[PDB]
Amino acid sequence: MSAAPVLSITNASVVYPDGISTVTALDSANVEIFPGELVAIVGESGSGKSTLLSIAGFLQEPTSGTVTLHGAEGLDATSTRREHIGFVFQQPNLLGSLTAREQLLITDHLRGIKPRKDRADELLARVGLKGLGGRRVAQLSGGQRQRVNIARALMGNPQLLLADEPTSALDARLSKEIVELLRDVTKEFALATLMVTHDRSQLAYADRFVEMADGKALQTAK
Amino acid sequence: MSAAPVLSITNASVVYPDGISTVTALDSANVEIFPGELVAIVGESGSGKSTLLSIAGFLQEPTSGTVTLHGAEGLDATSTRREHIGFVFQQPNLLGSLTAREQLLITDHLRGIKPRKDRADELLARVGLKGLGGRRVAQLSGGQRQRVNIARALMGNPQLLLADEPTSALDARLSKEIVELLRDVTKEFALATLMVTHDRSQLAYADRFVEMADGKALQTAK
Amino acid sequence: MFLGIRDIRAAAGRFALIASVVGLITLLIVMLTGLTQSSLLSMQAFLYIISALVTVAFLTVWTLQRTRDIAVLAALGASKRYLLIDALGQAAIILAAGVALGAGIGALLGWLIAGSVPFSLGWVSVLGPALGIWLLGLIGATIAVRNVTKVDPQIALGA
Amino acid sequence: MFLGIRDIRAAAGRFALIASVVGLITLLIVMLTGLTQSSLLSMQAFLYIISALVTVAFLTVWTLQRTRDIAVLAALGASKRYLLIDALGQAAIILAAGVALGAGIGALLGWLIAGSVPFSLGWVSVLGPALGIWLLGLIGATIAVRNVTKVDPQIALGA
Numbered sequence A, B: 001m002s003a004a005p006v007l008s009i010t011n012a013s014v015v016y017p018d019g020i021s022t023v024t025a026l027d028s029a030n031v032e033i034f035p036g037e038l039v040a041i042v043g044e045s046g047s048g049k050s051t052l053l054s055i056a057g058f059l060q061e062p063t064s065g066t067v068t069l070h071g072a073e074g075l076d077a078t079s080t081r082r083e084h085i086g087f088v089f090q091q092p093n094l095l096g097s098l099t100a101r102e103q104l105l106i107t108d109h110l111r112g113i114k115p116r117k118d119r120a121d122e123l124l125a126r127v128g129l130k131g132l133g134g135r136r137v138a139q140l141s142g143g144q145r146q147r148v149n150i151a152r153a154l155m156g157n158p159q160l161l162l163a164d165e166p167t168s169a170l171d172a173r174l175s176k177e178i179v180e181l182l183r184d185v186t187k188e189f190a191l192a193t194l195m196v197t198h199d200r201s202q203l204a205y206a207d208r209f210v211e212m213a214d215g216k217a218l219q220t221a222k
Numbered sequence C, D: 001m002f003l004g005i006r007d008i009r010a011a012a013g014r015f016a017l018i019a020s021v022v023g024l025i026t027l028l029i030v031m032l033t034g035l036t037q038s039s040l041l042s043m044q045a046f047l048y049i050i051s052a053l054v055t056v057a058f059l060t061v062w063t064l065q066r067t068r069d070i071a072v073l074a075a076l077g078a079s080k081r082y083l084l085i086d087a088l089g090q091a092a093i094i095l096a097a098g099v100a101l102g103a104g105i106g107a108l109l110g111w112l113i114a115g116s117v118p119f120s121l122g123w124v125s126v127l128g129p130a131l132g133i134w135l136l137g138l139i140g141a142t143i144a145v146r147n148v149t150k151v152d153p154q155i156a157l158g159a
Helices: A049-056 A077-084 A100-110 A117-126 A142-155 A172-188 A200-205 B049-056 B077-084 B100-110 B117-126 B142-155 B172-188 B200-205 C002-010 C012-036 C039-076 C080-113 C124-145 C153-157 D002-010 D012-036 D039-076 D080-113 D124-145 D153-157
Strands: A007-018 A021-033 A038-042 A064-069 A085-088 A160-164 A192-196 A208-213 A216-220 B007-018 B021-033 B038-042 B064-069 B085-088 B160-164 B192-196 B208-213 B216-220
Touching: A007 A049, A021 A049, A021 A192, A038 A049, A038 A172, A038 A200, A049 A160, A049 A192, A049 A208, A049 C153, A077 A085, A077 C039, A085 A142, A100 A117, A100 A142, A100 C002, A100 C039, A117 A142, A142 A172, A172 A192, A172 A200, B007 B049, B021 B049, B021 B192, B038 B049, B038 B172, B038 B200, B049 B160, B049 B192, B049 B208, B049 D153, B077 B085, B077 D039, B085 B142, B100 B117, B100 B142, B100 D002, B100 D039, B117 B142, B142 B172, B172 B192, B172 B200, C002 C012, C002 C039, C002 C080, C012 C039, C012 C080, C012 C124, C039 C080, C039 C124, C039 C153, C039 D039, C080 C124, D002 D012, D002 D039, D002 D080, D012 D039, D012 D080, D012 D124, D039 D080, D039 D124, D039 D153, D080 D124
Parallel strands: A021 A216, A038 A192, A038 A208, A085 A160, A160 A192, B021 B216, B038 B192, B038 B208, B085 B160, B160 B192
Antiparallel strands: A007 A021, A007 A064, A208 A216, B007 B021, B007 B064, B208 B216
């Protein structure tokens, strides 16, 4: 019983122009993730965590090396995101004119299909906002905003879920709730979840880690 | 030989509206800092580090409690910043149309006085960019940008220096250089430096810490 | 078109103000052509150009303010075609509302005023200017949102 | 005024384009008044209004793009009076350059063309419009940068 990977990043590197010189934002990173895993990318600030996440999310192309989402072969990056990836951004990134439920429904819209209101409400209930489908963004607390962000990432039934330090603006109790929710939907929906964090109080909710140091990645079980 | 404090924050609290509810971003924080000290504010993300820094920098008023910059009594917040504080922002926050030297000189300009070019060049030399006074921002690497940011904060001879995770976008070697430079000018210019960081590889360069947890601050020597 | 209509709803004030402006100027042109039927035609042309410039200004400001919502949508996976259709449909709906209200109330006023000053109201005299200013503004709106397809989705990754 | 002039220098293209636009329209008004000396005065007034609207549009877009530099300056401790003087002086310098070049080249062209079509060039006929469009644009620039004093310095604290 050895599942195929959902995401394979082999010797990927991101080199940026840094003024007149260059900076190697990411150096031959190799990660691989399978359904139902929460892999935490850890490491001091400036070691390439968010860069690994952005190439894993097809937001950036690597300058050398490969990022493969098995089941998206033949798609360009935007469509790969639109059809297979969910984005739990660090900022909740909710659209002000839309209601909470509409934050979920619009991802159905841009995916080409008639928005499914019942699924939207079920997913808002699932992340702990049962019945708040009509709340405007100004009425949601930062915790609730983040929960909406997660439900939005679930709306399209993605195979890959990328969480970029989604508890950075939350206290201890809300951070624990949010990381528990992330692990719980990772296991329930069999997502492959890449989660960037700097708080060690969170590593207990991971199955394994990628230690980052100076753009170098090492896959660790402890 | 007991110097007077440069900054005294006694039982300051920041309460924000969080949607329909409220969030206590900062809870009765007490810190006090004297000339020549580098005090590091540490704690997991979302525990109020940047809020403590923003009230210490008169960027926000506390909703209850007191922030006093001894020697700025009688000034409003903006003038307190303009006449006594230096800001090593997390982003270098350099102005694109200006040359490196002009990043320093404009703080002389808005302070009301004729810009001092020789002092500007001396301070660029001091942070390790001797002779790069004419470089445009596009020609400076992220490390060099941060060094310019520091020199700009030194230009006005401030008594208080607030560094907000200024190595977050830098590798191990540059982070070590930048924190060494911060400690070295803190001691040389007898600044009271409040530095927010999340990287423990930096705590060795501090004289003491403020541990943050859920908006609560505790002054620690270890 | 989803987000465009929702934007219209949520920020009804600014959109109603700009629709009133464009409808007022379309009604001005309606009455000017109705009284026309060198100097008059020159005035009509320059006022068409004024309406176009007003549309261009408002829409560049609106798009520049929408930048981060557009960035979030691009990151999630919205296509260029999709974002462009949304922006242009928002603009077209607002300009249609404007030109329609202006032309209707102007034709009404012309039927009421045809007795004191020689007024010629036809259906071309009202539709030609209506669709004309509509297409004026739509060309200008294309000019304005030219760089909606440009926004870097990694903007969404920041703070 | 420091940052304003440096902005003019560093982004010379956009500022030269808008100065050419405003100088061209000032020259248009110069020639129109020189040939004037109902329809003509109406055209002059509406073209003054066009110049004002162009200034307002460009300056709101420019300020909205400058927002983060203004935020950094506010955080460092720049006063409202200081930022407002900087923005308004930038606008005034550009509009002065525009009106001056336009009026000068228009007076030259009028002296050259006074032989074929009745042209009346005086000093009022060139200065009144020059300072008039200058103040038009300055009132509009105040309207535009009304919220330069508004920016929240904590914007600088973000990423």
